[PDB]
C-alpha cells in the first residue's frame, strides 16, 4: 500500500560495495551532494577535472593545441560566462547543493593528492559554477548545438 | 539507446516495469556513465549519470523512475550569411556586426603560455563562424535562458506524484531527449521533451540545413510549451517505448500521428530494424514478469536477414562461382541470431554493408519500401537480386580479407576486452535488428574487434513494494588508473549475469567493502 519506511540517516558516510558502487548517506541535502562529489572524484576524478577545465574555456591554456578548437567554440558562444550567470540565477536551496558537490570533489583531492594526475591538478579548486558550466556545455553545445553541424 | 515502461495490467504481478538502456561511446570521457545511490531523511535516488553531473539522469527509487534516449530535438539553427560591405545583408539592408575582441592562453610545448587574439562577431542571429569553404555561418541556440536544467532533473526524480513530476518537466529547462516514466502507483509515460523554436514554415529537413540569414522571416524568437510536444500516458497498449526512432510509434496502438504536430519537430524517416524489434517485443508479450522482461532485453535478432535472405539465397545459388554457392548455403543454414558460435554472422554483415551502406541504414535496395502503415514489417525483400549477388561476391572477399575465412565464429572475432579480461562477444549492430547493442569496431590485423559503442548502463526495475532491480555497467564504475573496478563487470556482461541493485539499508550493510565517514 504505502512505500516501505524510508531510512533516516543519523550520520554522514559512504558505504562502498564490492563493485565500487558508492552508497552516500547524508543527514541533509547538502551533505548528500558533498558525498556524491567526493565519490565521483574518487572514481573518475581525472576526467571530471579535465572536463570542468574545458568548460571554463581554459582547455587550450591548461593542455595546449589539441584542446584549442573546443576552447574557441565555447568562447565564441560565451558558455563559461553564461555559466556564471546561470549559477547566480539558481535558487538558494539548490545553489547550496551545487556548492557542496564541488566542495566534495575538492575535499577528496585534498585528502588524496596522490590519486590526481599531475596535469589536471591546476584545475583545482572547483566551484558550483564549474558544475553548472560543464552541464551547460554538455546539454547545449555537445548534444543540441554541436561544433560539427555549425562548421561542417 | 532503448527504453521500455510497462503498465501494471500488462504484467503478471501488477507492478510497473522500467528499462534503462542508454547507448554511448565506450571511450569518450564526457559520455561515461557512473552508478551511485544517495540517501537523506527526505529522499532517495539510485542510478547512473554522466560523470561530472551532480544529478542522476537515469534514476529510480521505491516510488518512481525515468530513463532517456536521443530524439535529436533541433534546438538550433545555422544561418548562412550574405557578406557585404563589411557587414551582412538583412531585410534589404547591409547591417553591421557586433564585434568583441577577446583572448585566451595557449600552452606551449615548453610549458609557457602564449596569448592569442580571438574576435567574436555576432549578427542578429547569434555568434558567427567561418567554414573552411569560406561560408559565413551564424548559429542561434534556443533556451540560452533556462538556468534550471539540473534542478528540473532533481525535482523530476524526487517527485512524490506523477503530477508533481509533470509540473517539473513543464518548466522547459531540459533542452532535449525523449524521457520515459513509471512509478509504484501504476502510471507510465513517454515524452518528446526539449526546447523547440516556434516556426511558421519549413519542414524539419529545412531547419537542419543552412537557413537564409538575410531576412527577419526566419528569425524565430519563441519556443513551444510542453503541451505542443508529442506525449503518451497510460495508453491502451499498456506500454511505451523509444529506440532513437521518430516518435510515431511510442506505443501500439498509436495515440496520435505526424499530422497532429508541426513538421519541424521530428523526422518522418523509416524506423530502424532495432526499433521495430522494440515494438514487437513489447506488444507481442503479455503478463510479463521482471525475469521475462530482462530476457527480452537480450534479443539479438538479425532482422535484416529475415528481410533479405529469402530473395538472396536462391539467386546466389545459380551463380557459377562455387564459393558463392558455398557462401549461400552457409548463410541459409544460419538461425539468424548473433550468437558467439555463429559461423555465418560476420559474412552476413559484410554483405549488408554493401547492400545497405556502411551504417546499414540504406533503403534503395529493398523491394518493398518502409511504410508507417506496416511499421514493424517493412521494408522487405531484395529489389535487384542480380546486383545483390555481385555484392555478395565482394563480401566474400572482404570477409576473408578481414577475418581470414568466410566461416569464422562470431565470438572468436568479436571480443570484449578490458584490462586483462578477454571474453567472447554476442549481439551486435542495432541497425541490423539487434535489440541489445554492441557496435563492433573494425578488426585488427588478426581479425579481432571490440565494442566501440553500445550497451553501457543496463537496469530493469519492477516497482513492487519494496522495489526489485538488477543492472550492469559494461565498463565498471571507475576509470582511475589502477582501479580494480574497471573490468570487473565485463565478464558478467558476456553471460548476461546481472547484479541485484541494492537500495535497502540492510542489504547495503550486508555487502559493504569500505566505509568512508565524512563531515561537510
Ligand atoms: C553531433 C551532435 O550534435 O550529436 C551529439 C550526439 C551524439 C554523437 O554522435 O556524438 N550521440 C550519441 O552517441 C547518441 N546518444 C545516445 O543515443 C544516448 C542518449 C541518452 C543519453 O545520452 O543519456 C547521440 S546523443 C547526441
mmCIF file of C-alpha atoms in Angstrom, chain B residues 107-463:
data_model
loop_
_atom_site.group_PDB
_atom_site.id
_atom_site.type_symbol
_atom_site.label_atom_id
_atom_site.label_comp_id
_atom_site.label_asym_id
_atom_site.label_seq_id
_atom_site.Cartn_x
_atom_site.Cartn_y
_atom_site.Cartn_z
ATOM 1 C CA UNK B 107 50.014 26.317 -23.657
ATOM 2 C CA UNK B 108 53.361 25.850 -25.408
ATOM 3 C CA UNK B 109 55.463 22.679 -25.730
ATOM 4 C CA UNK B 110 57.920 24.066 -23.169
ATOM 5 C CA UNK B 111 55.238 24.858 -20.594
ATOM 6 C CA UNK B 112 54.904 28.608 -21.177
ATOM 7 C CA UNK B 113 51.658 30.199 -22.379
ATOM 8 C CA UNK B 114 51.263 32.434 -25.420
ATOM 9 C CA UNK B 115 48.454 34.971 -25.589
ATOM 10 C CA UNK B 116 46.182 34.594 -28.612
ATOM 11 C CA UNK B 117 43.681 37.077 -30.155
ATOM 12 C CA UNK B 118 40.101 35.962 -30.742
ATOM 13 C CA UNK B 119 37.487 38.181 -32.375
ATOM 14 C CA UNK B 120 33.848 37.360 -31.699
ATOM 15 C CA UNK B 121 31.461 38.697 -34.347
ATOM 16 C CA UNK B 122 27.690 38.444 -33.947
ATOM 17 C CA UNK B 123 24.712 39.000 -36.210
ATOM 18 C CA UNK B 124 21.129 39.450 -35.007
ATOM 19 C CA UNK B 125 21.028 35.634 -35.208
ATOM 20 C CA UNK B 126 23.970 34.834 -32.938
ATOM 21 C CA UNK B 127 27.719 34.072 -32.971
ATOM 22 C CA UNK B 128 29.305 33.950 -36.429
ATOM 23 C CA UNK B 129 31.744 31.293 -37.627
ATOM 24 C CA UNK B 130 33.510 30.823 -40.954
ATOM 25 C CA UNK B 131 33.690 27.340 -42.514
ATOM 26 C CA UNK B 132 36.723 26.011 -44.379
ATOM 27 C CA UNK B 133 34.875 26.516 -47.679
ATOM 28 C CA UNK B 134 34.576 30.214 -46.847
ATOM 29 C CA UNK B 135 30.888 30.184 -45.872
ATOM 30 C CA UNK B 136 29.892 32.609 -43.093
ATOM 31 C CA UNK B 137 27.510 30.892 -40.660
ATOM 32 C CA UNK B 138 25.642 32.273 -37.640
ATOM 33 C CA UNK B 139 24.325 29.863 -35.020
ATOM 34 C CA UNK B 140 21.222 30.626 -32.963
ATOM 35 C CA UNK B 141 20.734 28.332 -29.983
ATOM 36 C CA UNK B 142 17.391 28.220 -28.189
ATOM 37 C CA UNK B 143 16.932 28.055 -24.434
ATOM 38 C CA UNK B 144 20.054 30.032 -23.535
ATOM 39 C CA UNK B 145 17.831 31.462 -20.787
ATOM 40 C CA UNK B 146 16.969 28.194 -18.976
ATOM 41 C CA UNK B 147 19.364 28.058 -15.980
ATOM 42 C CA UNK B 148 17.365 25.346 -14.246
ATOM 43 C CA UNK B 149 18.413 22.197 -16.140
ATOM 44 C CA UNK B 150 19.959 20.452 -13.152
ATOM 45 C CA UNK B 151 17.221 21.374 -10.679
ATOM 46 C CA UNK B 152 14.466 20.259 -13.058
ATOM 47 C CA UNK B 153 16.011 16.800 -13.163
ATOM 48 C CA UNK B 154 16.418 16.837 -9.388
ATOM 49 C CA UNK B 155 12.764 17.695 -8.799
ATOM 50 C CA UNK B 156 11.631 15.308 -11.516
ATOM 51 C CA UNK B 157 13.349 12.291 -9.925
ATOM 52 C CA UNK B 158 12.380 13.219 -6.351
ATOM 53 C CA UNK B 159 8.749 13.815 -7.319
ATOM 54 C CA UNK B 160 6.131 12.422 -4.940
ATOM 55 C CA UNK B 161 3.491 12.150 -7.647
ATOM 56 C CA UNK B 162 3.216 11.963 -11.406
ATOM 57 C CA UNK B 163 1.545 15.372 -11.218
ATOM 58 C CA UNK B 164 4.491 16.992 -9.471
ATOM 59 C CA UNK B 165 6.701 15.185 -11.991
ATOM 60 C CA UNK B 166 4.842 16.697 -14.952
ATOM 61 C CA UNK B 167 4.855 20.058 -13.176
ATOM 62 C CA UNK B 168 8.651 19.865 -13.061
ATOM 63 C CA UNK B 169 9.039 18.875 -16.706
ATOM 64 C CA UNK B 170 6.707 21.726 -17.686
ATOM 65 C CA UNK B 171 9.366 24.295 -16.694
ATOM 66 C CA UNK B 172 11.036 23.519 -20.031
ATOM 67 C CA UNK B 173 14.588 23.605 -18.631
ATOM 68 C CA UNK B 174 15.927 20.352 -20.195
ATOM 69 C CA UNK B 175 16.689 21.226 -23.879
ATOM 70 C CA UNK B 176 16.351 17.718 -25.321
ATOM 71 C CA UNK B 177 15.834 13.944 -25.048
ATOM 72 C CA UNK B 178 12.887 11.557 -25.014
ATOM 73 C CA UNK B 179 12.030 10.636 -21.416
ATOM 74 C CA UNK B 180 10.106 7.642 -20.087
ATOM 75 C CA UNK B 181 8.464 7.358 -16.651
ATOM 76 C CA UNK B 182 6.929 4.702 -14.387
ATOM 77 C CA UNK B 183 6.014 4.561 -10.690
ATOM 78 C CA UNK B 184 4.606 2.367 -7.930
ATOM 79 C CA UNK B 185 1.194 3.957 -8.469
ATOM 80 C CA UNK B 186 0.958 2.329 -11.883
ATOM 81 C CA UNK B 187 1.462 5.261 -14.218
ATOM 82 C CA UNK B 188 3.704 5.070 -17.268
ATOM 83 C CA UNK B 189 4.541 7.912 -19.647
ATOM 84 C CA UNK B 190 6.559 8.819 -22.762
ATOM 85 C CA UNK B 191 7.639 12.407 -23.584
ATOM 86 C CA UNK B 192 9.272 14.014 -26.617
ATOM 87 C CA UNK B 193 10.986 16.629 -24.437
ATOM 88 C CA UNK B 194 13.152 19.605 -25.342
ATOM 89 C CA UNK B 195 13.039 23.290 -26.271
ATOM 90 C CA UNK B 196 11.771 23.756 -29.834
ATOM 91 C CA UNK B 197 11.594 27.151 -31.590
ATOM 92 C CA UNK B 198 8.164 28.210 -32.867
ATOM 93 C CA UNK B 199 8.196 28.500 -36.653
ATOM 94 C CA UNK B 200 5.590 29.341 -39.276
ATOM 95 C CA UNK B 201 7.101 27.454 -42.216
ATOM 96 C CA UNK B 202 9.532 24.728 -43.271
ATOM 97 C CA UNK B 203 9.832 21.004 -42.526
ATOM 98 C CA UNK B 204 12.462 19.634 -40.149
ATOM 99 C CA UNK B 205 14.813 18.970 -43.077
ATOM 100 C CA UNK B 206 14.654 22.675 -43.942
ATOM 101 C CA UNK B 207 15.686 23.761 -40.462
ATOM 102 C CA UNK B 208 18.515 21.219 -40.273
ATOM 103 C CA UNK B 209 20.230 22.834 -43.237
ATOM 104 C CA UNK B 210 21.598 26.315 -43.834
ATOM 105 C CA UNK B 211 18.620 28.620 -43.376
ATOM 106 C CA UNK B 212 18.768 32.010 -45.178
ATOM 107 C CA UNK B 213 20.300 34.624 -42.888
ATOM 108 C CA UNK B 214 19.264 37.724 -44.818
ATOM 109 C CA UNK B 215 15.645 38.088 -43.730
ATOM 110 C CA UNK B 216 13.777 38.555 -40.435
ATOM 111 C CA UNK B 217 11.424 35.990 -41.926
ATOM 112 C CA UNK B 218 13.460 33.123 -40.453
ATOM 113 C CA UNK B 219 14.374 34.759 -37.144
ATOM 114 C CA UNK B 220 12.298 32.831 -34.588
ATOM 115 C CA UNK B 221 12.017 34.192 -31.064
ATOM 116 C CA UNK B 222 9.635 31.907 -29.184
ATOM 117 C CA UNK B 223 9.620 28.288 -28.082
ATOM 118 C CA UNK B 224 6.929 25.621 -27.596
ATOM 119 C CA UNK B 225 5.154 24.725 -24.316
ATOM 120 C CA UNK B 226 5.197 21.134 -23.078
ATOM 121 C CA UNK B 227 1.660 20.713 -24.434
ATOM 122 C CA UNK B 228 2.727 21.229 -28.049
ATOM 123 C CA UNK B 229 5.033 18.205 -27.938
ATOM 124 C CA UNK B 230 4.228 14.506 -28.644
ATOM 125 C CA UNK B 231 3.432 12.735 -25.384
ATOM 126 C CA UNK B 232 1.821 9.494 -24.226
ATOM 127 C CA UNK B 233 0.417 8.492 -20.827
ATOM 128 C CA UNK B 234 -1.190 5.195 -19.767
ATOM 129 C CA UNK B 235 -2.017 4.231 -23.393
ATOM 130 C CA UNK B 236 -4.416 1.416 -24.371
ATOM 131 C CA UNK B 237 -1.417 -0.666 -25.383
ATOM 132 C CA UNK B 238 -0.105 -0.913 -21.837
ATOM 133 C CA UNK B 239 3.421 0.317 -22.606
ATOM 134 C CA UNK B 240 5.652 2.978 -24.137
ATOM 135 C CA UNK B 241 8.988 2.734 -25.917
ATOM 136 C CA UNK B 242 11.635 4.546 -27.903
ATOM 137 C CA UNK B 243 14.852 3.428 -29.527
ATOM 138 C CA UNK B 244 16.017 6.695 -31.095
ATOM 139 C CA UNK B 245 13.292 6.269 -33.704
ATOM 140 C CA UNK B 246 10.900 9.101 -34.641
ATOM 141 C CA UNK B 247 8.091 9.476 -32.019
ATOM 142 C CA UNK B 248 5.471 7.993 -34.336
ATOM 143 C CA UNK B 249 5.313 4.540 -32.734
ATOM 144 C CA UNK B 250 5.703 5.193 -28.988
ATOM 145 C CA UNK B 251 3.078 2.556 -28.326
ATOM 146 C CA UNK B 252 0.796 0.055 -30.066
ATOM 147 C CA UNK B 253 -1.854 1.031 -30.964
ATOM 148 C CA UNK B 254 -0.620 4.599 -31.515
ATOM 149 C CA UNK B 255 -2.418 7.567 -29.915
ATOM 150 C CA UNK B 256 -1.580 10.236 -32.489
ATOM 151 C CA UNK B 257 0.216 10.697 -35.787
ATOM 152 C CA UNK B 258 2.607 13.027 -37.682
ATOM 153 C CA UNK B 259 -0.229 15.290 -38.895
ATOM 154 C CA UNK B 260 -1.017 16.343 -35.300
ATOM 155 C CA UNK B 261 2.235 18.290 -34.826
ATOM 156 C CA UNK B 262 4.239 20.879 -36.813
ATOM 157 C CA UNK B 263 6.503 19.198 -39.385
ATOM 158 C CA UNK B 264 9.694 20.619 -37.883
ATOM 159 C CA UNK B 265 9.586 18.704 -34.589
ATOM 160 C CA UNK B 266 10.796 15.231 -35.649
ATOM 161 C CA UNK B 267 11.758 13.400 -38.845
ATOM 162 C CA UNK B 268 9.415 11.026 -40.659
ATOM 163 C CA UNK B 269 12.039 8.539 -41.796
ATOM 164 C CA UNK B 270 11.921 4.694 -41.850
ATOM 165 C CA UNK B 271 12.236 3.296 -38.314
ATOM 166 C CA UNK B 272 15.344 1.185 -37.703
ATOM 167 C CA UNK B 273 15.029 -2.600 -37.513
ATOM 168 C CA UNK B 274 16.070 -2.471 -33.858
ATOM 169 C CA UNK B 275 13.253 -0.004 -33.164
ATOM 170 C CA UNK B 276 10.874 -2.348 -34.939
ATOM 171 C CA UNK B 277 12.047 -5.238 -32.746
ATOM 172 C CA UNK B 278 11.279 -2.952 -29.791
ATOM 173 C CA UNK B 279 7.605 -2.514 -30.657
ATOM 174 C CA UNK B 280 7.310 -6.240 -31.407
ATOM 175 C CA UNK B 281 8.972 -7.487 -28.227
ATOM 176 C CA UNK B 282 6.618 -5.409 -26.081
ATOM 177 C CA UNK B 283 3.273 -5.580 -27.929
ATOM 178 C CA UNK B 284 3.559 -9.299 -28.638
ATOM 179 C CA UNK B 285 4.065 -10.206 -24.987
ATOM 180 C CA UNK B 286 1.626 -10.151 -22.099
ATOM 181 C CA UNK B 287 1.610 -11.000 -18.393
ATOM 182 C CA UNK B 288 5.312 -10.133 -18.062
ATOM 183 C CA UNK B 289 7.493 -10.826 -15.022
ATOM 184 C CA UNK B 290 10.707 -8.972 -14.257
ATOM 185 C CA UNK B 291 12.633 -12.119 -15.211
ATOM 186 C CA UNK B 292 10.880 -12.453 -18.571
ATOM 187 C CA UNK B 293 11.288 -8.702 -19.117
ATOM 188 C CA UNK B 294 15.072 -8.913 -18.731
ATOM 189 C CA UNK B 295 15.193 -11.955 -21.022
ATOM 190 C CA UNK B 296 13.542 -9.971 -23.818
ATOM 191 C CA UNK B 297 16.193 -7.259 -23.414
ATOM 192 C CA UNK B 298 18.846 -9.764 -24.534
ATOM 193 C CA UNK B 299 17.347 -10.107 -28.035
ATOM 194 C CA UNK B 300 19.985 -10.207 -30.778
ATOM 195 C CA UNK B 301 17.988 -10.947 -33.932
ATOM 196 C CA UNK B 302 19.442 -10.424 -37.397
ATOM 197 C CA UNK B 303 16.164 -8.932 -38.664
ATOM 198 C CA UNK B 304 17.918 -7.698 -41.825
ATOM 199 C CA UNK B 305 18.445 -11.357 -42.722
ATOM 200 C CA UNK B 306 14.760 -12.204 -42.310
ATOM 201 C CA UNK B 307 14.098 -9.336 -44.710
ATOM 202 C CA UNK B 308 16.611 -10.311 -47.390
ATOM 203 C CA UNK B 309 17.948 -13.889 -47.268
ATOM 204 C CA UNK B 310 14.778 -15.400 -48.835
ATOM 205 C CA UNK B 311 15.486 -13.439 -52.017
ATOM 206 C CA UNK B 312 19.284 -13.529 -51.936
ATOM 207 C CA UNK B 313 19.962 -17.213 -51.228
ATOM 208 C CA UNK B 314 18.126 -18.602 -54.261
ATOM 209 C CA UNK B 315 19.691 -16.092 -56.666
ATOM 210 C CA UNK B 316 23.165 -16.645 -55.248
ATOM 211 C CA UNK B 317 22.878 -20.396 -55.778
ATOM 212 C CA UNK B 318 22.660 -20.112 -59.563
ATOM 213 C CA UNK B 319 25.944 -18.218 -59.747
ATOM 214 C CA UNK B 320 28.762 -20.251 -61.392
ATOM 215 C CA UNK B 321 31.303 -19.359 -58.684
ATOM 216 C CA UNK B 322 31.362 -22.435 -56.372
ATOM 217 C CA UNK B 323 32.499 -20.237 -53.467
ATOM 218 C CA UNK B 324 29.449 -18.011 -53.877
ATOM 219 C CA UNK B 325 27.321 -21.139 -53.733
ATOM 220 C CA UNK B 326 29.026 -22.382 -50.575
ATOM 221 C CA UNK B 327 28.536 -18.926 -49.067
ATOM 222 C CA UNK B 328 24.847 -19.089 -49.943
ATOM 223 C CA UNK B 329 24.455 -22.432 -48.188
ATOM 224 C CA UNK B 330 26.342 -21.166 -45.128
ATOM 225 C CA UNK B 331 24.032 -18.154 -44.807
ATOM 226 C CA UNK B 332 20.885 -20.181 -45.478
ATOM 227 C CA UNK B 333 21.742 -22.594 -42.653
ATOM 228 C CA UNK B 334 22.105 -19.789 -40.106
ATOM 229 C CA UNK B 335 19.470 -19.375 -37.393
ATOM 230 C CA UNK B 336 19.767 -15.616 -37.998
ATOM 231 C CA UNK B 337 20.805 -14.798 -34.441
ATOM 232 C CA UNK B 338 24.033 -13.001 -33.457
ATOM 233 C CA UNK B 339 25.419 -15.676 -31.127
ATOM 234 C CA UNK B 340 29.068 -16.295 -30.266
ATOM 235 C CA UNK B 341 29.134 -19.540 -32.267
ATOM 236 C CA UNK B 342 27.589 -18.189 -35.492
ATOM 237 C CA UNK B 343 29.787 -19.063 -38.472
ATOM 238 C CA UNK B 344 27.568 -17.085 -40.828
ATOM 239 C CA UNK B 345 27.165 -13.811 -38.907
ATOM 240 C CA UNK B 346 30.351 -11.995 -39.992
ATOM 241 C CA UNK B 347 29.838 -12.860 -43.657
ATOM 242 C CA UNK B 348 26.264 -11.536 -43.397
ATOM 243 C CA UNK B 349 27.369 -8.156 -42.006
ATOM 244 C CA UNK B 350 29.892 -7.667 -44.823
ATOM 245 C CA UNK B 351 27.099 -8.276 -47.287
ATOM 246 C CA UNK B 352 24.778 -5.843 -45.510
ATOM 247 C CA UNK B 353 27.493 -3.181 -45.544
ATOM 248 C CA UNK B 354 27.269 -3.186 -49.339
ATOM 249 C CA UNK B 355 23.532 -3.834 -49.602
ATOM 250 C CA UNK B 356 22.546 -1.112 -47.141
ATOM 251 C CA UNK B 357 25.545 1.217 -46.853
ATOM 252 C CA UNK B 358 28.172 1.285 -44.102
ATOM 253 C CA UNK B 359 25.740 2.352 -41.376
ATOM 254 C CA UNK B 360 23.230 -0.275 -42.583
ATOM 255 C CA UNK B 361 20.520 2.377 -42.888
ATOM 256 C CA UNK B 362 20.370 2.429 -46.700
ATOM 257 C CA UNK B 363 16.931 1.762 -48.209
ATOM 258 C CA UNK B 364 17.403 1.883 -52.005
ATOM 259 C CA UNK B 365 17.992 -1.868 -52.242
ATOM 260 C CA UNK B 366 14.720 -3.228 -50.851
ATOM 261 C CA UNK B 367 11.847 -4.447 -52.993
ATOM 262 C CA UNK B 368 9.136 -3.099 -50.707
ATOM 263 C CA UNK B 369 9.749 0.327 -49.117
ATOM 264 C CA UNK B 370 9.025 1.120 -45.482
ATOM 265 C CA UNK B 371 5.537 2.326 -44.608
ATOM 266 C CA UNK B 372 4.137 3.822 -41.435
ATOM 267 C CA UNK B 373 1.163 1.571 -42.138
ATOM 268 C CA UNK B 374 3.331 -1.512 -41.649
ATOM 269 C CA UNK B 375 5.918 -0.001 -39.234
ATOM 270 C CA UNK B 376 7.293 -3.313 -37.975
ATOM 271 C CA UNK B 377 7.354 -5.383 -41.179
ATOM 272 C CA UNK B 378 8.841 -3.069 -43.823
ATOM 273 C CA UNK B 379 10.995 -2.595 -45.845
ATOM 274 C CA UNK B 380 11.190 -6.133 -47.245
ATOM 275 C CA UNK B 381 12.906 -8.180 -49.933
ATOM 276 C CA UNK B 382 15.714 -7.557 -52.408
ATOM 277 C CA UNK B 383 14.935 -5.313 -55.380
ATOM 278 C CA UNK B 384 17.774 -6.442 -57.652
ATOM 279 C CA UNK B 385 18.820 -9.985 -56.723
ATOM 280 C CA UNK B 386 21.289 -9.979 -59.630
ATOM 281 C CA UNK B 387 23.212 -6.972 -58.314
ATOM 282 C CA UNK B 388 22.768 -8.197 -54.741
ATOM 283 C CA UNK B 389 24.718 -11.344 -55.610
ATOM 284 C CA UNK B 390 27.630 -9.335 -57.030
ATOM 285 C CA UNK B 391 27.643 -7.511 -53.715
ATOM 286 C CA UNK B 392 27.806 -10.931 -52.043
ATOM 287 C CA UNK B 393 30.694 -11.910 -54.301
ATOM 288 C CA UNK B 394 32.569 -8.886 -52.966
ATOM 289 C CA UNK B 395 31.528 -9.523 -49.361
ATOM 290 C CA UNK B 396 33.126 -12.955 -49.608
ATOM 291 C CA UNK B 397 36.446 -11.325 -50.457
ATOM 292 C CA UNK B 398 36.034 -8.644 -47.806
ATOM 293 C CA UNK B 399 35.137 -11.221 -45.166
ATOM 294 C CA UNK B 400 38.131 -13.475 -45.874
ATOM 295 C CA UNK B 401 40.420 -10.464 -46.017
ATOM 296 C CA UNK B 402 39.147 -9.125 -42.687
ATOM 297 C CA UNK B 403 38.770 -12.297 -40.649
ATOM 298 C CA UNK B 404 40.746 -14.962 -42.503
ATOM 299 C CA UNK B 405 37.817 -17.158 -43.614
ATOM 300 C CA UNK B 406 34.162 -16.851 -44.591
ATOM 301 C CA UNK B 407 33.073 -19.050 -41.704
ATOM 302 C CA UNK B 408 34.923 -17.758 -38.654
ATOM 303 C CA UNK B 409 32.989 -17.936 -35.335
ATOM 304 C CA UNK B 410 31.360 -14.583 -34.470
ATOM 305 C CA UNK B 411 32.557 -14.778 -30.866
ATOM 306 C CA UNK B 412 36.085 -15.606 -31.951
ATOM 307 C CA UNK B 413 36.482 -12.346 -33.840
ATOM 308 C CA UNK B 414 34.089 -10.346 -31.631
ATOM 309 C CA UNK B 415 35.593 -9.981 -28.137
ATOM 310 C CA UNK B 416 35.010 -7.692 -25.181
ATOM 311 C CA UNK B 417 38.428 -6.787 -23.778
ATOM 312 C CA UNK B 418 39.102 -4.630 -20.712
ATOM 313 C CA UNK B 419 42.459 -4.718 -18.918
ATOM 314 C CA UNK B 420 43.435 -8.404 -18.797
ATOM 315 C CA UNK B 421 39.881 -9.737 -19.105
ATOM 316 C CA UNK B 422 39.110 -11.164 -22.536
ATOM 317 C CA UNK B 423 35.667 -12.708 -23.083
ATOM 318 C CA UNK B 424 33.567 -13.831 -26.109
ATOM 319 C CA UNK B 425 31.079 -11.405 -27.634
ATOM 320 C CA UNK B 426 27.421 -11.718 -28.680
ATOM 321 C CA UNK B 427 24.737 -9.419 -30.128
ATOM 322 C CA UNK B 428 25.743 -6.581 -32.416
ATOM 323 C CA UNK B 429 24.703 -3.775 -34.738
ATOM 324 C CA UNK B 430 21.340 -2.261 -33.872
ATOM 325 C CA UNK B 431 20.545 -1.304 -37.465
ATOM 326 C CA UNK B 432 20.631 -4.983 -38.459
ATOM 327 C CA UNK B 433 17.897 -5.545 -35.871
ATOM 328 C CA UNK B 434 19.790 -6.428 -32.672
ATOM 329 C CA UNK B 435 17.933 -5.017 -29.654
ATOM 330 C CA UNK B 436 20.865 -5.491 -27.310
ATOM 331 C CA UNK B 437 23.604 -3.430 -28.952
ATOM 332 C CA UNK B 438 27.330 -3.763 -29.495
ATOM 333 C CA UNK B 439 28.676 -1.624 -32.326
ATOM 334 C CA UNK B 440 31.750 -3.700 -33.104
ATOM 335 C CA UNK B 441 34.825 -1.841 -34.311
ATOM 336 C CA UNK B 442 36.810 -2.654 -37.433
ATOM 337 C CA UNK B 443 39.025 -5.714 -36.891
ATOM 338 C CA UNK B 444 42.748 -5.514 -36.207
ATOM 339 C CA UNK B 445 45.436 -7.313 -38.210
ATOM 340 C CA UNK B 446 44.247 -10.572 -36.601
ATOM 341 C CA UNK B 447 40.517 -10.113 -37.152
ATOM 342 C CA UNK B 448 39.867 -9.191 -33.520
ATOM 343 C CA UNK B 449 37.321 -6.470 -32.762
ATOM 344 C CA UNK B 450 35.670 -4.988 -29.663
ATOM 345 C CA UNK B 451 32.692 -2.719 -28.767
ATOM 346 C CA UNK B 452 33.256 0.932 -29.644
ATOM 347 C CA UNK B 453 29.703 1.976 -28.754
ATOM 348 C CA UNK B 454 26.592 0.216 -27.396
ATOM 349 C CA UNK B 455 25.325 -1.243 -24.118
ATOM 350 C CA UNK B 456 26.650 0.705 -21.139
ATOM 351 C CA UNK B 457 24.312 1.127 -18.163
ATOM 352 C CA UNK B 458 21.580 -1.509 -18.187
ATOM 353 C CA UNK B 459 18.953 -1.796 -15.466
ATOM 354 C CA UNK B 460 15.459 -3.218 -15.264
ATOM 355 C CA UNK B 461 13.200 -2.291 -12.339
ATOM 356 C CA UNK B 462 9.918 -3.712 -11.058
ATOM 357 C CA UNK B 463 8.026 -1.199 -8.953
#
